[PDB]
Coordinates of C-alpha atoms in Angstrom, one line a residue:
Chain N
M1 CA 111.0 -71.2 -62.8
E2 CA 112.0 -75.3 -62.1
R3 CA 113.3 -76.3 -59.2
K4 CA 116.5 -78.8 -59.2
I5 CA 115.2 -81.8 -56.5
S6 CA 118.5 -83.1 -55.9
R7 CA 119.2 -85.6 -52.9
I8 CA 121.7 -85.0 -50.4
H9 CA 121.7 -85.2 -46.6
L10 CA 123.7 -82.9 -44.0
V11 CA 126.0 -84.4 -41.4
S12 CA 126.0 -82.2 -38.5
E13 CA 121.8 -82.5 -38.1
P14 CA 120.6 -85.3 -39.7
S15 CA 117.4 -84.6 -38.1
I16 CA 117.4 -81.5 -40.2
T17 CA 117.9 -82.2 -44.2
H18 CA 118.3 -78.7 -46.0
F19 CA 118.9 -79.1 -49.7
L20 CA 121.0 -77.9 -51.7
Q21 CA 118.7 -76.7 -54.3
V22 CA 120.8 -74.5 -57.2
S23 CA 117.5 -73.7 -58.9
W24 CA 119.1 -72.1 -61.8
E25 CA 117.8 -69.9 -64.3
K26 CA 116.9 -70.0 -68.0
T27 CA 119.7 -67.7 -69.5
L28 CA 122.1 -68.2 -66.7
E29 CA 124.1 -64.9 -68.2
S30 CA 122.0 -62.6 -67.2
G31 CA 122.0 -63.7 -63.7
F32 CA 120.7 -66.5 -61.3
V33 CA 118.3 -67.4 -57.9
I34 CA 119.9 -69.5 -55.1
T35 CA 117.4 -72.0 -53.3
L36 CA 117.7 -73.2 -49.9
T37 CA 115.1 -74.4 -47.8
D38 CA 114.1 -75.6 -43.4
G39 CA 110.3 -75.9 -43.8
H40 CA 109.4 -72.5 -42.9
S41 CA 112.1 -69.8 -44.2
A42 CA 114.0 -69.4 -47.4
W43 CA 116.3 -67.2 -49.2
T44 CA 116.6 -65.8 -52.9
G45 CA 119.9 -64.5 -54.8
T46 CA 119.3 -60.5 -57.0
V47 CA 122.2 -59.9 -59.5
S48 CA 123.0 -56.6 -60.1
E49 CA 125.6 -54.6 -62.3
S50 CA 128.0 -54.0 -59.5
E51 CA 128.0 -57.9 -58.6
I52 CA 128.5 -59.3 -61.8
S53 CA 131.4 -57.2 -62.7
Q54 CA 133.1 -58.0 -59.8
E55 CA 132.5 -62.2 -60.7
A56 CA 134.2 -61.4 -63.7
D57 CA 137.0 -59.4 -62.2
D58 CA 137.7 -61.1 -59.4
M59 CA 137.7 -64.2 -59.9
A60 CA 139.3 -64.2 -63.3
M61 CA 138.5 -67.4 -65.6
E62 CA 138.5 -66.8 -69.0
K63 CA 137.8 -70.2 -70.8
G64 CA 139.0 -71.7 -67.9
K65 CA 137.4 -74.9 -66.0
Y66 CA 135.0 -74.0 -63.3
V67 CA 132.1 -75.8 -65.6
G68 CA 132.6 -79.3 -63.9
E69 CA 133.5 -77.9 -60.1
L70 CA 130.1 -76.2 -61.0
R71 CA 128.2 -79.0 -61.8
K72 CA 130.7 -81.4 -58.7
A73 CA 129.9 -79.0 -56.0
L74 CA 126.4 -77.2 -56.3
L75 CA 124.5 -79.8 -58.3
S76 CA 125.7 -82.6 -56.2
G77 CA 127.1 -84.0 -59.5
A78 CA 129.9 -86.6 -57.9
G79 CA 129.6 -90.5 -57.3
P80 CA 128.4 -91.3 -53.9
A81 CA 131.9 -91.8 -53.4
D82 CA 132.8 -88.9 -51.5
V83 CA 131.1 -86.7 -49.0
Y84 CA 130.8 -82.7 -49.6
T85 CA 131.1 -81.4 -46.4
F86 CA 128.5 -78.4 -48.1
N87 CA 126.8 -77.4 -44.2
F88 CA 125.0 -74.2 -44.2
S89 CA 125.2 -72.3 -41.0
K90 CA 121.3 -72.7 -39.3
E91 CA 122.9 -70.6 -36.2
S92 CA 124.4 -68.0 -38.1
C93 CA 122.6 -68.1 -41.9
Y94 CA 125.4 -67.9 -43.9
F95 CA 125.9 -70.1 -46.4
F96 CA 129.3 -70.3 -47.7
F97 CA 130.6 -73.4 -50.2
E98 CA 134.0 -73.8 -48.8
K99 CA 135.5 -77.1 -51.0
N100 CA 136.8 -79.3 -48.5
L101 CA 138.5 -81.2 -51.0
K102 CA 141.6 -82.8 -49.5
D103 CA 141.0 -81.6 -45.9
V104 CA 142.5 -78.0 -47.6
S105 CA 140.0 -74.8 -46.7
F106 CA 140.9 -71.5 -48.4
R107 CA 139.4 -68.8 -48.4
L108 CA 137.5 -69.8 -51.9
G109 CA 133.5 -69.4 -50.6
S110 CA 132.1 -66.0 -49.1
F111 CA 129.7 -64.5 -51.4
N112 CA 126.5 -62.0 -49.6
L113 CA 123.6 -63.6 -49.6
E114 CA 119.9 -62.0 -49.9
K115 CA 117.3 -61.8 -47.4
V116 CA 114.2 -63.6 -49.1
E117 CA 111.5 -61.5 -50.1
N118 CA 109.0 -64.4 -50.1
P119 CA 108.7 -67.8 -48.9
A120 CA 105.9 -68.6 -50.5
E121 CA 107.1 -67.9 -54.3
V122 CA 109.5 -70.7 -53.5
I123 CA 107.5 -72.8 -50.9
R124 CA 104.3 -72.9 -53.4
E125 CA 106.1 -73.2 -56.4
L126 CA 108.9 -76.6 -55.1
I127 CA 105.6 -78.3 -54.3
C128 CA 103.6 -77.9 -57.1
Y129 CA 106.5 -79.1 -59.2
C130 CA 107.3 -81.7 -57.4
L131 CA 104.2 -82.8 -58.1
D132 CA 104.3 -82.0 -61.9
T133 CA 107.7 -83.9 -62.4
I134 CA 106.1 -87.2 -60.9
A135 CA 102.6 -86.7 -63.5
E136 CA 105.1 -86.2 -65.7
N137 CA 107.1 -89.3 -64.9
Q138 CA 104.5 -91.2 -65.1
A139 CA 103.0 -89.9 -68.1
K140 CA 106.0 -90.2 -70.2
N141 CA 106.6 -94.1 -68.6
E142 CA 103.2 -95.1 -70.4
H143 CA 103.9 -93.3 -73.4
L144 CA 107.2 -95.5 -73.3
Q145 CA 105.8 -98.6 -72.2
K146 CA 103.0 -98.5 -75.0
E147 CA 106.1 -97.7 -77.3
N148 CA 107.9 -100.7 -76.3
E149 CA 104.6 -103.0 -76.9
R150 CA 104.2 -101.7 -80.1
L151 CA 107.4 -101.4 -81.5
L152 CA 107.3 -105.4 -80.3
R153 CA 104.6 -106.0 -81.8
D154 CA 105.7 -105.3 -85.1
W155 CA 109.2 -106.6 -84.8
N156 CA 107.5 -110.5 -84.7
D157 CA 104.8 -109.3 -87.4
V158 CA 107.6 -107.9 -89.6
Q159 CA 109.8 -110.8 -89.4
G160 CA 106.9 -113.3 -89.4
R161 CA 106.7 -112.3 -92.9
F162 CA 110.4 -112.0 -93.5
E163 CA 109.6 -116.2 -92.8
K164 CA 107.1 -115.6 -95.7
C165 CA 108.8 -114.0 -97.5
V166 CA 111.7 -116.0 -98.0
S167 CA 110.0 -118.9 -97.7
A168 CA 107.4 -117.7 -101.1
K169 CA 110.9 -116.2 -102.3
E170 CA 112.3 -120.1 -102.1
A171 CA 108.8 -122.2 -103.7
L172 CA 108.2 -118.5 -106.4
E173 CA 112.1 -120.1 -108.0
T174 CA 111.4 -123.4 -107.8
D175 CA 108.1 -123.1 -109.3
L176 CA 108.5 -120.4 -112.1
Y177 CA 111.0 -122.9 -113.5
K178 CA 108.7 -125.7 -113.9
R179 CA 106.2 -124.0 -115.0
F180 CA 109.4 -122.2 -118.3
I181 CA 110.5 -125.8 -118.0
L182 CA 106.4 -127.4 -118.6
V183 CA 105.5 -124.0 -121.5
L184 CA 108.8 -124.1 -123.6
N185 CA 108.5 -128.2 -123.5
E186 CA 105.3 -128.0 -125.0
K187 CA 105.7 -125.5 -127.3
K188 CA 108.8 -127.4 -129.1
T189 CA 106.1 -130.6 -129.0
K190 CA 104.0 -128.0 -131.0
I191 CA 107.0 -127.6 -133.1
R192 CA 108.0 -130.7 -133.6
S193 CA 104.3 -131.6 -134.3
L194 CA 104.0 -128.9 -137.5
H195 CA 107.2 -130.5 -138.2
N196 CA 106.5 -134.1 -138.0
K197 CA 102.7 -133.2 -141.1
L198 CA 104.6 -130.1 -143.3
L199 CA 107.1 -133.1 -143.6
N200 CA 104.5 -136.2 -145.6
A201 CA 102.1 -132.7 -146.1
Chain D
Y1 CA 119.6 -119.4 -128.2
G2 CA 120.6 -122.9 -127.2
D3 CA 117.0 -124.9 -126.6
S4 CA 117.0 -128.0 -128.9
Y5 CA 114.2 -130.3 -130.6
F6 CA 116.0 -133.1 -129.9
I7 CA 117.9 -132.8 -126.5
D8 CA 115.8 -131.2 -124.0
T9 CA 117.3 -127.9 -121.0
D10 CA 116.7 -129.3 -118.0
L11 CA 116.3 -126.5 -114.3
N12 CA 120.0 -126.1 -115.0
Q13 CA 120.4 -126.1 -118.9
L14 CA 117.8 -124.1 -118.9
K15 CA 119.0 -121.4 -116.4
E16 CA 122.3 -121.5 -118.0
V17 CA 119.9 -120.8 -121.4
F18 CA 118.8 -117.8 -119.1
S19 CA 121.9 -116.4 -117.8
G20 CA 123.5 -116.1 -121.5
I21 CA 120.9 -114.5 -123.0
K22 CA 122.0 -111.0 -121.7
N23 CA 119.9 -109.1 -119.6
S24 CA 119.1 -106.0 -119.8
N25 CA 115.9 -103.1 -119.4
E26 CA 114.4 -102.3 -122.0
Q27 CA 110.1 -102.2 -122.1
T28 CA 108.9 -100.0 -118.7
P29 CA 107.8 -100.9 -115.8
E30 CA 104.2 -100.2 -116.9
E31 CA 103.8 -102.7 -120.4
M32 CA 106.2 -105.2 -118.4
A33 CA 103.2 -106.0 -116.1
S34 CA 100.8 -105.4 -118.0
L35 CA 101.8 -108.3 -121.2
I36 CA 103.1 -110.8 -117.5
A37 CA 99.7 -110.0 -116.1
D38 CA 98.4 -111.0 -119.8
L39 CA 100.2 -113.7 -120.2
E40 CA 99.1 -115.0 -116.7
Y41 CA 95.3 -114.6 -117.5
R42 CA 96.0 -116.2 -120.4
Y43 CA 97.1 -119.5 -119.1
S44 CA 95.7 -119.1 -115.2
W45 CA 99.1 -118.5 -114.0
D46 CA 97.5 -115.2 -112.0
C47 CA 96.3 -118.0 -109.4
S48 CA 99.8 -118.3 -107.7
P49 CA 98.9 -118.1 -103.8
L50 CA 102.1 -116.0 -103.4
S51 CA 101.0 -113.0 -106.6
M52 CA 97.6 -111.9 -106.7
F53 CA 98.0 -107.6 -106.4
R54 CA 100.0 -107.2 -109.7
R55 CA 96.1 -106.2 -110.5
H56 CA 94.9 -104.2 -108.1
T57 CA 96.9 -101.7 -107.1
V58 CA 95.8 -100.0 -103.5
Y59 CA 96.3 -96.1 -103.8
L60 CA 96.7 -96.2 -99.7
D61 CA 96.1 -92.3 -98.8
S62 CA 99.2 -92.2 -96.1
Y63 CA 99.6 -88.7 -96.7
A64 CA 96.5 -85.9 -95.3
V65 CA 98.5 -82.8 -96.6
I66 CA 98.1 -82.7 -100.4
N67 CA 101.9 -81.6 -100.9
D68 CA 103.9 -80.6 -98.3
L69 CA 107.3 -81.9 -97.5
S70 CA 107.3 -80.5 -94.3
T71 CA 106.2 -83.3 -91.9
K72 CA 107.2 -87.2 -92.3
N73 CA 105.8 -89.5 -90.1
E74 CA 108.0 -91.8 -88.1
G75 CA 107.7 -95.1 -86.6
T76 CA 104.0 -96.0 -88.1
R77 CA 102.8 -99.0 -89.5
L78 CA 102.6 -97.5 -93.2
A79 CA 105.7 -99.1 -94.0
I80 CA 104.6 -102.6 -92.7
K81 CA 101.8 -102.0 -95.0
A82 CA 103.2 -100.8 -97.8
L83 CA 105.4 -103.6 -98.0
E84 CA 102.1 -106.1 -97.1
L85 CA 101.4 -104.8 -100.3
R86 CA 105.0 -105.8 -101.8
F87 CA 105.1 -108.9 -101.2
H88 CA 102.1 -110.0 -103.0
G89 CA 103.1 -107.0 -106.3
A90 CA 101.4 -104.7 -105.4
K91 CA 102.9 -101.3 -106.1
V92 CA 101.8 -98.5 -104.1
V93 CA 101.7 -94.8 -106.1
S94 CA 101.3 -91.1 -104.2
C95 CA 100.5 -89.7 -107.3
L96 CA 96.8 -89.1 -108.3
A97 CA 95.7 -90.0 -112.1
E98 CA 93.2 -91.4 -114.3
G99 CA 95.1 -94.9 -113.7
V100 CA 94.0 -94.9 -110.4
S101 CA 90.5 -96.6 -109.5
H102 CA 90.9 -97.2 -105.9
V103 CA 90.7 -95.3 -103.1
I104 CA 91.5 -96.8 -99.3
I105 CA 92.0 -94.9 -96.4
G106 CA 93.9 -96.0 -93.1
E107 CA 92.8 -97.2 -90.3
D108 CA 90.9 -93.9 -90.1
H109 CA 87.5 -95.5 -90.9
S110 CA 84.7 -91.9 -89.8
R111 CA 85.2 -90.4 -92.6
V112 CA 82.5 -92.5 -94.1
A113 CA 81.1 -88.9 -95.0
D114 CA 83.3 -88.5 -98.0
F115 CA 82.9 -91.9 -99.5
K116 CA 78.7 -91.1 -99.2
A117 CA 78.7 -88.1 -100.5
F118 CA 81.5 -88.9 -103.8
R119 CA 79.1 -92.0 -104.2
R120 CA 76.4 -89.6 -106.1
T121 CA 79.4 -88.2 -107.8
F122 CA 81.8 -91.0 -109.0
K123 CA 80.0 -93.5 -111.5
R124 CA 82.9 -95.5 -110.4
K125 CA 81.5 -97.8 -107.5
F126 CA 84.5 -98.2 -105.4
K127 CA 84.7 -101.4 -102.8
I128 CA 86.0 -101.1 -99.9
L129 CA 86.3 -104.1 -97.8
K130 CA 87.3 -104.5 -93.9
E131 CA 90.7 -104.5 -92.5
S132 CA 90.6 -107.9 -91.7
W133 CA 90.8 -109.0 -94.8
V134 CA 94.8 -107.8 -95.0
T135 CA 95.2 -108.9 -91.8
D136 CA 93.8 -112.7 -93.0
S137 CA 96.9 -112.5 -95.2
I138 CA 99.1 -112.7 -92.1
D139 CA 96.6 -114.7 -90.1
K140 CA 95.5 -117.1 -92.5
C141 CA 97.8 -116.5 -95.2
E142 CA 95.0 -117.6 -97.7
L143 CA 93.3 -116.3 -100.5
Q144 CA 89.8 -115.2 -100.2
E145 CA 87.7 -118.3 -103.1
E146 CA 84.6 -117.0 -105.2
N147 CA 82.3 -118.4 -103.5
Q148 CA 81.9 -115.8 -101.2
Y149 CA 80.3 -113.6 -103.5
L150 CA 76.9 -114.7 -104.2
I151 CA 73.4 -112.6 -103.2
Chain F
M1 CA 102.1 -95.4 -48.7
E2 CA 101.4 -93.3 -52.4
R3 CA 100.3 -90.0 -52.5
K4 CA 96.8 -88.9 -55.1
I5 CA 97.8 -85.8 -56.9
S6 CA 94.2 -84.4 -58.4
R7 CA 93.7 -80.6 -59.4
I8 CA 90.6 -79.0 -58.2
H9 CA 89.6 -74.9 -60.0
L10 CA 88.0 -72.5 -58.0
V11 CA 86.1 -69.7 -59.8
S12 CA 86.2 -68.0 -57.2
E13 CA 89.3 -67.0 -55.5
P14 CA 92.2 -68.6 -57.1
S15 CA 94.4 -66.3 -55.0
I16 CA 95.0 -69.1 -52.2
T17 CA 96.3 -72.4 -52.9
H18 CA 95.6 -75.8 -50.8
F19 CA 97.1 -78.9 -51.9
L20 CA 95.4 -82.3 -50.4
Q21 CA 98.1 -84.8 -49.1
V22 CA 96.6 -88.3 -47.5
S23 CA 98.8 -90.7 -47.6
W24 CA 96.6 -94.6 -48.4
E25 CA 97.7 -97.5 -45.8
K26 CA 96.4 -100.0 -43.6
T27 CA 93.2 -101.1 -45.1
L28 CA 89.6 -100.7 -44.6
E29 CA 89.0 -104.7 -43.9
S30 CA 91.7 -104.0 -39.9
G31 CA 90.9 -99.6 -39.6
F32 CA 92.4 -96.8 -41.7
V33 CA 94.5 -93.8 -41.3
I34 CA 93.8 -90.3 -43.0
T35 CA 96.5 -87.8 -42.7
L36 CA 96.1 -83.9 -43.6
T37 CA 99.0 -82.2 -44.2
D38 CA 99.0 -79.3 -46.4
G39 CA 103.5 -78.6 -47.1
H40 CA 103.8 -76.0 -44.3
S41 CA 101.3 -77.4 -40.5
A42 CA 100.5 -81.0 -41.0
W43 CA 97.1 -82.2 -39.4
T44 CA 98.0 -86.1 -38.4
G45 CA 94.6 -87.3 -36.9
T46 CA 93.1 -90.8 -36.2
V47 CA 90.0 -91.7 -37.5
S48 CA 87.5 -93.9 -35.7
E49 CA 85.5 -97.2 -37.1
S50 CA 82.0 -94.9 -36.3
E51 CA 82.2 -93.6 -39.4
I52 CA 82.5 -96.4 -41.8
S53 CA 80.0 -98.0 -41.7
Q54 CA 77.0 -95.4 -40.6
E55 CA 77.6 -93.6 -43.7
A56 CA 76.5 -95.2 -45.8
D57 CA 73.5 -96.3 -43.8
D58 CA 71.8 -93.0 -41.9
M59 CA 70.5 -91.8 -45.5
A60 CA 69.9 -95.4 -47.0
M61 CA 70.7 -94.4 -50.6
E62 CA 72.6 -96.9 -52.6
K63 CA 76.5 -97.1 -51.4
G64 CA 77.7 -96.7 -54.8
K65 CA 77.3 -93.2 -53.8
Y66 CA 80.0 -93.6 -51.4
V67 CA 82.2 -95.9 -52.7
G68 CA 82.2 -94.7 -56.3
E69 CA 82.8 -90.6 -55.6
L70 CA 85.2 -92.0 -53.5
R71 CA 87.0 -93.7 -56.3
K72 CA 86.2 -91.4 -58.6
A73 CA 87.9 -88.6 -56.6
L74 CA 91.0 -89.7 -56.4
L75 CA 91.2 -91.2 -60.2
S76 CA 91.5 -87.9 -61.4
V77 CA 84.5 -80.1 -58.2
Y78 CA 84.7 -79.9 -54.3
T79 CA 84.0 -76.7 -52.8
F80 CA 87.0 -76.1 -50.1
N81 CA 85.5 -75.0 -47.0
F82 CA 88.5 -74.9 -44.4
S83 CA 87.8 -73.2 -40.4
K84 CA 90.8 -72.2 -38.9
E85 CA 89.7 -72.0 -35.9
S86 CA 88.0 -75.4 -36.0
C87 CA 90.8 -77.6 -37.2
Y88 CA 88.5 -79.9 -38.8
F89 CA 88.0 -80.8 -42.4
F90 CA 84.8 -81.4 -44.2
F91 CA 83.8 -80.8 -48.0
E92 CA 79.6 -80.2 -49.6
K93 CA 79.0 -82.0 -53.4
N94 CA 77.1 -79.2 -54.7
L95 CA 74.8 -79.6 -57.6
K96 CA 71.3 -78.8 -59.2
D97 CA 68.4 -80.7 -57.1
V98 CA 70.8 -83.1 -56.5
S99 CA 73.0 -82.2 -52.9
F100 CA 74.8 -85.4 -50.8
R101 CA 76.9 -85.4 -48.1
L102 CA 80.0 -87.1 -48.6
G103 CA 83.1 -86.5 -46.5
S104 CA 82.6 -86.5 -42.9
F105 CA 86.2 -87.8 -42.3
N106 CA 87.0 -86.8 -38.1
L107 CA 90.6 -85.3 -38.3
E108 CA 92.6 -83.7 -35.1
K109 CA 96.2 -81.7 -35.3
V110 CA 99.6 -83.1 -33.9
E111 CA 102.5 -80.9 -33.1
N112 CA 105.3 -82.8 -34.5
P113 CA 106.9 -80.2 -37.9
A114 CA 109.6 -82.9 -38.0
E115 CA 108.0 -85.9 -38.7
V116 CA 105.8 -84.3 -41.5
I117 CA 108.3 -82.8 -42.9
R118 CA 111.0 -85.7 -43.3
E119 CA 108.1 -88.3 -44.3
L120 CA 108.0 -85.6 -47.8
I121 CA 111.0 -84.9 -48.5
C122 CA 111.4 -88.8 -48.3
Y123 CA 108.3 -89.3 -50.3
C124 CA 109.3 -86.6 -53.4
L125 CA 113.3 -88.0 -52.8
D126 CA 111.8 -91.7 -53.1
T127 CA 109.7 -90.5 -55.9
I128 CA 111.9 -89.2 -57.6
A129 CA 114.7 -91.5 -58.3
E130 CA 112.4 -94.1 -58.1
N131 CA 110.2 -92.9 -61.9
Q132 CA 114.3 -91.5 -63.1
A133 CA 115.5 -95.2 -63.3
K134 CA 111.8 -96.6 -64.2
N135 CA 112.1 -94.3 -66.9
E136 CA 116.1 -94.2 -67.7
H137 CA 115.5 -98.5 -68.4
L138 CA 112.4 -97.7 -70.4
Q139 CA 114.4 -95.2 -72.2
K140 CA 116.5 -97.4 -72.7
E141 CA 114.5 -100.3 -73.7
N142 CA 112.2 -99.1 -76.4
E143 CA 115.1 -97.5 -78.7
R144 CA 117.5 -100.7 -78.4
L145 CA 114.7 -102.7 -79.6
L146 CA 113.6 -99.7 -82.2
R147 CA 117.0 -100.4 -83.4
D148 CA 115.8 -104.0 -84.2
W149 CA 113.2 -103.1 -85.7
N150 CA 114.9 -100.6 -88.0
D151 CA 117.2 -103.2 -89.0
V152 CA 114.6 -106.4 -89.3
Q153 CA 112.8 -103.0 -91.6
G154 CA 115.9 -102.3 -93.4
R155 CA 116.7 -106.9 -94.2
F156 CA 113.5 -107.0 -95.1
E157 CA 113.0 -104.8 -96.7
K158 CA 116.3 -105.6 -98.7
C159 CA 115.3 -109.1 -98.8
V160 CA 112.1 -108.4 -100.4
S161 CA 113.3 -106.1 -103.0
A162 CA 116.3 -109.1 -104.2
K163 CA 113.0 -111.0 -104.4
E164 CA 111.4 -109.1 -106.0
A165 CA 114.4 -108.6 -108.3
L166 CA 114.3 -112.3 -109.0
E167 CA 111.9 -112.2 -110.3
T168 CA 111.0 -109.6 -112.8
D169 CA 114.7 -111.0 -114.0
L170 CA 113.0 -114.3 -114.3
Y171 CA 109.7 -112.6 -116.0
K172 CA 112.1 -110.9 -118.4
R173 CA 113.6 -113.8 -119.3
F174 CA 110.9 -116.5 -119.7
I175 CA 108.9 -113.7 -121.8
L176 CA 112.3 -113.4 -124.0
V177 CA 112.3 -116.9 -125.2
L178 CA 108.5 -117.5 -124.9
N179 CA 108.9 -115.0 -128.2
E180 CA 111.9 -116.6 -129.6
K181 CA 109.0 -119.1 -129.5
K182 CA 106.1 -117.4 -130.6
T183 CA 107.7 -116.4 -133.7
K184 CA 109.4 -120.2 -134.1
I185 CA 106.4 -120.9 -134.2
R186 CA 104.4 -118.3 -136.6
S187 CA 107.7 -118.5 -138.8
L188 CA 106.8 -123.1 -138.9
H189 CA 103.1 -122.2 -139.1
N190 CA 103.8 -120.6 -142.7
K191 CA 106.4 -122.4 -144.1
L192 CA 103.0 -125.5 -142.9
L193 CA 100.3 -123.0 -145.7
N194 CA 102.3 -121.1 -147.3
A195 CA 104.4 -123.9 -149.1

């Protein structure tokens, strides 16, 4: 349902560019379909009871360390420092995901591939999903730029409000104290005057 | 208290007298605010340029729905409006009662229909000013004189 | 240099899909090139200078019906009738009581299947990389600005609360001393009057 666009370039034939597009489906436990494209031909994958059973009983992974290897080998998750020789044999129509780990070639990657049911259902999906991804990238870019502008303006407004409130407090303490002093002094003067009048009443 | 009829108390002495008097909570906020307003109006102290919204309990209708806790307006400027209102002393309320005499909606002023309907119903003719007036407390940062209220 | 993306709805037949991909470059003031590619069979034809000025002069109406229509066609309904036996692309604008022909761009067909696919691959890869980088910069930018906004909101709130508390307790103390003085005034008046 989704196409994972990953930057990859062939080494044997730089002119011909193939994509190691591991477009894993949702609920990977149910299964996945591999997607290799060249311009005119594609390939897919199938999941069977025997295939699941052999995947479970051959590699024998129970709480292992294969998730990182899947992410680096299939999705090119490793940094651009080590080149991965994931060369798909165009003439042989055979994709062997052999691991060239320090120039040691074990018999690791050898599994069958299934004939594509329809190249259209993947070519159209890729050419529409690329445009959709670009469009949503532009949309989120614009929306987050607008949010950035809103954050800047509100931050400046509340910094101004902080300065204003600090000034208001600084003036408020002083003028409140002055008003209190004036009122109390007036009241004391009233008391003094009334007492003076009563002294000779 | 330390106040004397022969020796006046300066700023520091009055501060010490106030501090010596224990500070606690014995008066309700509504009653204390009402007495403050009455004393300020009795001798013209409410004219301070920093606190004029004590009497004007402006209600901010920041809630579109009533009695629904499943939503939360995150990243909105309603908090900025609340801070602006509380800077001058106005305190906002979220529960409707009989003490609220003003209804103010946010920037969604396209709700003139309910205002028109309520004008015929409610005898309490509300007053709604433009949104530039509240922004004048930040841009102009000055009060509005009574000469503007004319024919 | 870039490519325009637009969506068109076909009421008649939706089971057949065609996509327009024209790279805009070499502005019209010194000649322009229009390239067409459906993703599988690319037709790269060079247009001529004899179909740029006469398009707005043959029927003698306002030039807006061409410049504005082209501007609003890229920025977003045409009916697609592409003749495979003639290899010419055209479209007619049909309305009610209004019918003005718009598309008269001549195009040819190329034989290279590798240049166009390389261009499309480079375009998609570069667009993905640039939008991902710009977007990531923008999420980080707006998120730490929003953290700064949260911090300034908190500090402003606590400062305003402290100011309000100082005002409140100063008012409380002044009210207490004012009540004390009021009682003193009342007692002194009582002494002056009754006694």
